Design an enzyme around this catalytic site. Structure first.
Site, short mmCIF file in Angstrom:
data_model
loop_
_atom_site.label_atom_id
_atom_site.label_comp_id
_atom_site.label_asym_id
_atom_site.label_seq_id
_atom_site.Cartn_x
_atom_site.Cartn_y
_atom_site.Cartn_z
N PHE C 59 0.81 -1.21 0.00
CA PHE C 59 0.00 0.00 0.00
C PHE C 59 0.85 1.27 0.00
CE2 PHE C 59 -2.82 -3.28 1.54
CZ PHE C 59 -4.02 -2.99 0.92
N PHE C 112 2.92 10.48 2.48
CA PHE C 112 3.10 9.06 2.23
C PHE C 112 3.45 8.84 0.77
CE2 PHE C 112 -1.00 8.01 0.14
CZ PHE C 112 -1.70 9.17 0.40
N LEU C 121 -8.32 6.63 -1.86
CA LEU C 121 -7.84 7.85 -1.22
C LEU C 121 -8.04 9.09 -2.09
CD1 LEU C 121 -4.49 6.68 0.41
CD2 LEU C 121 -6.77 6.81 1.43
N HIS C 125 -6.96 12.92 -0.08
CA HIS C 125 -5.57 13.27 0.16
C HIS C 125 -5.00 13.97 -1.06
CE1 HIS C 125 -5.22 10.83 3.88
NE2 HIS C 125 -6.18 10.14 3.30
#
Ligand SMILES: CCn1c(-c2cc(N3CCN(C4CC4)CC3)cnc2[C@H](C)OC)c2c3cc(ccc31)-c1csc(n1)C[C@H](NC(=O)[C@H]1[C@@H]3COC[C@@H]31)C(=O)N1CCC[C@H](N1)C(=O)OCC(C)(C)C2
Ligand SMILES: CCn1c(-c2cc(N3CCN(C4CC4)CC3)cnc2[C@H](C)OC)c2c3cc(ccc31)-c1csc(n1)C[C@H](NC(=O)[C@H]1[C@@H]3COC[C@@H]31)C(=O)N1CCC[C@H](N1)C(=O)OCC(C)(C)C2
Ligand SMILES: Nc1nc2c(ncn2[C@@H]2O[C@H](COP(=O)(O)OP(=O)(O)NP(=O)(O)O)[C@@H](O)[C@H]2O)c(=O)[nH]1
Ligand SMILES: Nc1nc2c(ncn2[C@@H]2O[C@H](COP(=O)(O)OP(=O)(O)NP(=O)(O)O)[C@@H](O)[C@H]2O)c(=O)[nH]1
Ligand SMILES: [Mg+2]
Ligand SMILES: [Mg+2]
Lengths: 163, 168, 163, 170
Positions: C59, C112, C121, C125
Site C-alpha cells: 500500500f 506518504f 484515497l 488526500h
C-alpha cells in the site's frame, strides 16, 4: 538459607519498581547459583541492562538474553548451556521462576516468571525460584506484552543484585 | 486454563476508542490523536469470580473501510459502541454501526454496550437522557466514560464481558 | 518548473539509498513548496532526522512527523495546518507522493508514498509529487513493514535537500 | 486491488520455516535459532505478470501445541509443508501435518507444496527421489530449498500461490 536477588525494572528507561526472588538453592543448587551470579554480575557478565524480550499476558514474562538481546542468546556461568538439574518443583502459579530452554539440557541464562499456572511445562523446564516481593511489578509488565510475546515498550533490568 | 473473550471497540474517528482501550490495558491516557489502523490487545482479569483472558480488537471508524469491518464483526463476540458526548455526528453513527453488526451477525441478539465517552468535557451536545433512551430502545447497557479521568472504563469493558457471559 | 528533492534513507542507521521526488508545483504550488522547504530545512525545521513510522507492504510508506516522532505530529511552513489545495492528481500507482491528513484541511508535514494504486484515497488526500529516482529504495522499505504499519527496524531520513 | 494470498508455513521444529520466511521478506539469512511463537508478514510480488499481496503466517511446530494448529489451518488458503533434508523425522512428520490440514479443512483438496529445505548441507538423509515420490502420491509439487543460499525460496512460495490460483479456478 536460600539466597535472595532483586531486579529493578524500567519501562523505556523510567523506573517501574523492584521485584525480588527467592532462589531454591536447597533443591536446585546449581541452577540457583547460576541465576544468583548472573544477577550480581560477579563473573563479568549478567542480567544488568538486559531486557524482557517476550511477554504474553496470561502466561509469563521471559527475559535473560544478555549476549544478543533478541531472545536467541544468553549463556550460563558453566558455559553456553548446562544440563537440566532436576524437575522436582512445578509451575504451580504466578511468581514461579523457571529456566527457558530449547529442549532437554539446554539451560543458559534465559528465564521466565509465570503470571499463571503453567502445568504442561512441568518436567520440561527447571523451576528454581519464586517471586518474593513485587509480583504486582511483574503483573504491570504484562501491560506491555502481546499474543506472540512482542513488547510494546522496552522492559529492562535497570539494576540487579543480591540482597 | 482461563476463558477467552473477544471484544471489538467500534465508533467514529476521534471518539476515544483507543484511549479507552489503552486506559484499560496500560492505565495510561493518550492525550494525542493517533488514528488507529488496527490493534489487538491481551489482558487477564478476574470478573465475577471467573478469571478470564480478554482479546480486544481496536478498530478504525473510517467510512471507506466498511467492507473490512465485516470481518471484525464475524469473529467478535461482543461490541463496545463508542460515541463522544461532544460529538453529535458520532452519536448518529451509532445507529449505523449497530445495523452493520446486526446484519453481519444475522441476529438481533448480539452482546453490545453503548458508551458515551469524554464525559469530563464541560461542553456537551448529547444529553445523558438521549443516550439512555437510545440504549433502552436497543435493549443494551449504557455507560458514560472519560478515558481522561478513567471514569467508567472498567465498567464498560466488564459490563460487556458480562453481557457476553449472559448471552452464552 | 517542478523542483526535485531527495531523501537519503537509513535502516537502523545503516545507509540504504536515495529516493528523489518530482514535486508538482505546476498543479499544487502551495503543497509542493511546503514539502520542498521541509526537505531543505531552510525554515529551521523539517524532515532531516525524522522516520517512516508506518510502512504497510502493498500500500504505502508514511512519514514526516518531525515535531513528535510518534506519528501524531508535524507542522507546515504555513502553520500547524493548511487547506487542501486541490485534488487534481490521483493515486494512480506506485511512486505517488501525497499528503497525510486527519480530515479535511489538516495538512501538516506528514506525507506518504504509494507502492500501489490506492484509488479509494482520491478526493481525500492531496497528491503533489512522485518518485523520480529510487523506487527500488521504497520497495526495500516495505521489507520492514507489517499489516498494521508498525515497522520492524527504524527507517529514517538521514539526509535530505533539493537537487 | 491486488489479490491477497494467505500462505501458512508448517513443519517440525528447526526445519527452517522462519529462515525461509525471513529470506522471502527481508532477503537475508537468520543463522541463529529464534523459536517461533507466531509471526505474520506481508509482501507484494509479481507472479506471472500479475501483482499480488502475500500474507505469510509463520507457525510453531512444537508437539506440545499440535492440538491448537486448528485455528491457523482453518483460515490459511495454502500450506508450505517444510522438512529438512538432513532430518528424517521431519520428513516423517509431513504425513501428520498433511492429514491434520485435510481434517481441519475437511477436504482432500487443499493447496500445498512439499518443501525440502537445508539442501546446501552435505549430510542428507532424505533422497530427492524419495520426496519426489511422496509429492507425486499427494498430487502436489515438490521444491528443494536452502534458506542459507536462497535456492528455491521464491520458487516455493510462488508455486504455492499458483496452486491456490488453480484450486480457486482463477
Ligand atoms: C500455539 C501457540 N503457542 C502457545 C499458546 C498456548 C495456549 N495454551 C496452552 C496450554 N493449554 C493448557 C493446558 C490447558 C491451554 C492453551 C494459549 N495461547 C498460546 C499463544 C499466545 O498463541 C499465539 C505457547 C507457545 C510457545 C511456543 C510456540 C507457540 C506457542 C515456543 C517456542 S520456544 C518455547 N515455546 C520454549 C522457550 N524457549 C526459548 O525461548 C529459547 C530460545 C533460544 O534458545 C534459548 C531460548 C521457553 O523456554 N519459554 C519459557 C516458558 C514459556 C515459553 N518460552 C513461551 O513463551 O510460551 C508461550 C505460551 C503462551 C505459554 C505457550
Ligand atoms: C480496515 C483496515 N485499513 C486499511 C486496509 C484496506 C484494504 N482495502 C481498501 C480498498 N478495498 C478496495 C475497494 C476494493 C479493499 C480493502 C486492505 N487492507 C488494509 C490494512 C492493511 O489492514 C489493516 C487501510 C486503513 C487506514 C486507516 C485505518 C484502517 C485501515 C487510517 C487511519 S488514519 C488514516 N488512515 C489517514 C492518515 N492520517 C494520519 O496518519 C494522521 C495522524 C495525526 O494527525 C496527522 C496524522 C493518512 O493520512 N495516511 C496516508 C494515506 C494512507 C493512510 N494513512 C493509511 O495508513 O492507510 C493504510 C491502507 C492499508 C492503505 C488502508
Ligand atoms: N477530554 C477528553 N479527551 C479525550 C478522552 N478520550 C480521548 N480523548 C482525546 O480525544 C482524541 C481522540 O482520541 P482516540 O482515543 O485517539 O480516538 P479513536 O476514537 O480511537 N479514533 P480512530 O477510530 O480514528 O482510531 C485524542 O486526542 C484523545 O486524547 C476523554 O475521555 N476526555
Ligand atoms: N545450512 C542451513 N541452515 C538452515 C537453513 N534453514 C534454516 N537453518 C538453520 O536451522 C536452524 C533452525 O532454523 P528456523 O528457521 O529457526 O526453524 P523453524 O523451522 O522455524 N523452527 P520452530 O518450529 O521451532 O519455530 C537455525 O539455526 C537456522 O539458521 C538452510 O536452508 N540451510
Ligand atoms: Mg483509535
Ligand atoms: Mg520458526
Amino acid at each position: 538459607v536460600n539466597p535472595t536477588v532483586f531486579f529493578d525494572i524500567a519501562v523505556d528507561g523510567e523506573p517501574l519498581g523492584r521485584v525480588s526472588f527467592e532462589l531454591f538453592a536447597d533443591k536446585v543448587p546449581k541452577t540457583a547459583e547460576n541465576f544468583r551470579a548472573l544477577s550480581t554480575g560477579e563473573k563479568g557478565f549478567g542480567y544488568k541492562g538486559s531486557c524482557f524480550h517476550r511477554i504474553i499476558p496470561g502466561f509469563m514474562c521471559q527475559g535473560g538474553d544478555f549476549t544478543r538481546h533478541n531472545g536467541t542468546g544468553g549463556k550460563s556461568i558453566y558455559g553456553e548451556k548446562f544440563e537440566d538439574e532436576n524437575f522436582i518443583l512445578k509451575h504451580t502459579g504466578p511468581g514461579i521462576l523457571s529456566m527457558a530452554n530449547a529442549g532437554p539440557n539446554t539451560n543458559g541464562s534465559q528465564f521466565f516468571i509465570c503470571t499463571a499456572k503453567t502445568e504442561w511445562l512441568d518436567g520440561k523446564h527447571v523451576v528454581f525460584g519464586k517471586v518474593k516481593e513485587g509480583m504486582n511489578i511483574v503483573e504491570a509488565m504484562e501491560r506491555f506484552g502481546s499474543r506472540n510475546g512482542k513488547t510494546s515498550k522496552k522492559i529492562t533490568i535497570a539494576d540487579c543484585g543480591q540482597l | 486454563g482461563m476463558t477467552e473473550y473477544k471484544l471489538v471497540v467500534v465508533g467514529a474517528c476521534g471518539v476515544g476508542k483507543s484511549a479507552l482501550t489503552i486506559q484499560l490495558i496500560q492505565n495510561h491516557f493518550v492525550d494525542e490523536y493517533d488514528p488507529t489502523i488496527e490493534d489487538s490487545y491481551r489482558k487477564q482479569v478476574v470478573i465475577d469470580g471467573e478469571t478470564c483472558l480478554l482479546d480486544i480488537l481496536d478498530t478504525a471508524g473510517q467510512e471507506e473501510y466498511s467492507a473490512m469491518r465485516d470481518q471484525y464483526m464475524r469473529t467478535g463476540e461482543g461490541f463496545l459502541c463508542v460515541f463522544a458526548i461532544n460529538n453529535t455526528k458520532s452519536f448518529e453513527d451509532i445507529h449505523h454501526y449497530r445495523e452493520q453488526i446486526k446484519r453481519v451477525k444475522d441476529s438481533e441478539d448480539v452482546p453490545m454496550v453503548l458508551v458515551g465517552n469524554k464525559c469530563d468535557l464541560p461542553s456537551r451536545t448529547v444529553d445523558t437522557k438521549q443516550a439512555q433512551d437510545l440504549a433502552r430502545s436497543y435493549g443494551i447497557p449504557f455507560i458514560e466514560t472519560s478515558a481522561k479521568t478513567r471514569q467508567g472504563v472498567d465498567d464498560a469493558f466488564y459490563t460487556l464481558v458480562r453481557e457476553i457471559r449472559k448471552h452464552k
